[PDB]
Every structure is written in C-alpha cells, then in structure tokens.
C-alpha cells in the first residue's frame, strides 16, 4: 500500500538516527538527531510528509510518539499513527544500515554525513530495481 | 528534463533557507540552516541525491558551492555543478503560516508541504509532488 511508512530509531556512536522506511518499496530516509524528543520527531515527520504522500506511520510506541507535539504534527499533516503495531516479518535493516555506515565511515569527517552516504547507497542498490525506483513507481498516480 | 535541479538561498530572520526546486515539476525541498556554509551545502546535496535522481544542479555560484567539501560531495554522488517564482511563492506561503509556529524551521516545512501538495487548476489538475513522481516513474519505464 503506497502511503504506509515505518519509523525506527537506532543508536550509534552515542547519537540517535531516526529511520523512516517506505514498507512497500524498502526506500529509506534518515537523520541524525541529538535525542529522541517529541519536537525532533515532529519536525522529522513534517519534513517526510511534505516530500511524499504519507497516510500512515507504524512506530515503536516510544515516548517521543506519545507526545502531544507528534500528535499535533500528524493531525496537521493528516497522518494516522499506528503505535506498537507490526505489519509483520527490520532489525535486519538497522543492522544493514549500520553495516553500510561502517563501510563509508572513513570517508566522512562526521557521522551525519556517513549516514546520508549510507542512505544513498541503500536506496540506489539494485536487488531488477532499486528501492528509489520502486517507491516512485508505486506512488505515481498519473 | 528529469535530473535537473536549481538551488537558491533566501534570508529570513537572520537565518538562511536553502531551496532546491525540481525544474520540470516545481516540486521543492528546503532546509533551514544558521549560515550558508560549504559544510551545510554539501550535506543538503547528499540528502537530496539519496532521495531523487539528481544529475545537474544549477546554482548562484557563491562561495558555499566552490568549497572542496561540496566538490567531494558532488564527485561522490555523481552530480554536475555547471523557478524564481516558485521561490517567491514559497516566501509568500511562509509569511501566511509564519505565526502558527514558534520556529522559522517549522513554518518553512509547513510551507513546503502546502506547496508540494496543492492541486494546480481544476478537476484534472496535479500537485507538484504528483508531477515529480510521475515525471521520474515515466523516465524509468
């Protein structure tokens, strides 16, 4: 289904990376944030929603998602929040993203740059179509 | 032409908004940064390139685009360095929602959302976010 995303967090070098996965395509977007707060999480989701037509987000039900800033953001953007609901068979994608980050880490002075290089690699990898090609094909309305 | 973008700066409240416009669609992305630095520019371009198939970026030629860190980012991502209304439109939306946010950055991203999702014309029309996705999907196929 084209409008369904899953958000996950992963912690590295003592920083936090918020990852949004477009479930149908495996396409990802990611940002390093200083901590898993309501306001940081809200701002991430507002940006994501401005970029793609986001109808539903599955979350881990962390306290950052139960916050009223996140709820305000989701209602403003018309996003339905599904807290603590798995769509079924991820920690692979976290271990994978961290695998790729580990491979490019020596090419960037700062972790945030390495994370973006890793996102680029991930979304462009042919598996035949890339995740980046699949998300657009799935979302296109004509 | 599917891989061409234009990047422009706007100054508001002593902050800088970097605005990337996908030329063929009018779709935008934007970020708010403290100052127009080579580091921030490179970071914005790698984020853009991991999301969309960016081949060419047209810019204002300022010193942020000349830096060795921007050249290293562009080399890595395969980007060649070699719409003014869209920016005035963005600025006007930002003004209209500005008071609904404590921070400039939240108003900027609301305006981005409003801009990319707004249908142009009547029944039969498209939003910029629909146009970009349709342009790229058609190009792949």
């Amino acid at each position: 289904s084209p409008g369904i995303w899953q958000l996950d967090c992963t912690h590295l070098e003592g920083k936090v990376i918020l990852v949004a996965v477009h479930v149908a395509s495996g396409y990802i977007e990611a940002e390093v944030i200083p901590a898993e707060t309501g306001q940081e999480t809200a701002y991430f989701l507002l940006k994501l929603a401005g970029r793609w037509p986001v109808k539903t987000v599955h979350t881990d039900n962390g306290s950052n998602f139960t916050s009223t800033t996140v709820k305000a953001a989701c209602d403003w953007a018309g996003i339905k929040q599904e807290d603590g609901i798995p769509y079924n068979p991820i920690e692979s994608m976290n271990k994978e993203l961290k695998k790729i980050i580990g491979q490019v880490r020596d090419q960037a002075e700062h972790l945030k740059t390495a994370v973006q290089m890793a996102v680029f690699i991930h979304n462009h990898k042919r598996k035949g179509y890339s995740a980046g090609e699949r998300i657009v094909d799935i979302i296109a309305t004509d | 032409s599917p891989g061409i973008w234009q990047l422009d700066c706007t100054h508001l409240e002593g902050k800088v908004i970097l605005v990337a416009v996908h030329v063929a669609s009018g779709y935008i992305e934007a970020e708010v940064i403290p100052a127009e630095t080579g580091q921030e520019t490179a970071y914005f371009l790698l984020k853009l390139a991991g999301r969309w198939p960016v081949k060419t970026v047209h810019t204002d030629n300022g010193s942020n685009f000349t830096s060795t860190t921007v050249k290293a980012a562009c080399d890595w991502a395969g980007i060649k360095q070699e719409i003014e209304s869209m920016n005035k439109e963005l600025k006007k939306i930002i003004g209209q929602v500005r008071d609904q946010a404590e921070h400039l950055k939240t108003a900027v991203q609301m305006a981005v959302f409003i801009h990319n999702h707004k249908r142009k014309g009547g029944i039969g029309g498209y939003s910029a976010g629909e146009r970009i996705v349709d342009i790229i999907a058609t190009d792949i196929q």
Binding site: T69, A73 | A101, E102, M110
Partner: peptide, 6 residues
C-alpha cells in the same frame, strides 16, 4: 502553536 509552543 504547531512545534514547542502552543
């Protein structure tokens, strides 16, 4: 206000 406000 959408963010920290309000």
């Amino acid at each position: 206000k959408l963010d920290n406000x309000x």
